[PDB]
């Protein structure tokens, strides 16, 4: 399994604990982009996994230097690939405005 610290962060993200997540990432910034193949579970995956995305939580991850270049689910989809699969222009636009890469 992943570290207790990463599991603690991911739980706080899933639970919508904005202030706790902010504090964890202030104190332990290197957690922000840690992902676990083959599920690709990660702080970001906990946000993007949801049919209705919590953009406050996504903004918090962005403030703490989350990136959008690694896969975010067990399909090995990047954030942009997920947006494409879901035909979600809201997510597409957010990702583009945050320099997310687009695969070929």
């Amino acid at each position: 399994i992943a570290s207790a610290e990463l599991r603690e962060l991911m739980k706080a993200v899933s639970e919508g604990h904005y202030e706790t997540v902010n504090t964890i990432l202030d104190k332990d910034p290197e957690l922000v982009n840690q992902y676990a193949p083959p599920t690709y579970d990660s702080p970001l995956a906990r946000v993007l996994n949801k049919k209705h995305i919590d953009y406050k939580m996504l903004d918090i991850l962005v403030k703490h230097h989350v990136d959008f270049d690694y896969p975010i689910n067990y399909h090995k989809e990047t954030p942009i690939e997920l947006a494409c699969k879901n035909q979600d222009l809201q997510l597409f636009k957010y990702l583009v405005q945050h320099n997310a890469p687009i695969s070929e």
Binding site: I1, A2, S3, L6, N33, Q34, Y35, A36, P37, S42, Y70
Partner: peptide
């Protein structure tokens, strides 16, 4: 990046 597991 890939987490230490």
């Amino acid at each position: 990046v890939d987490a230490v597991n």
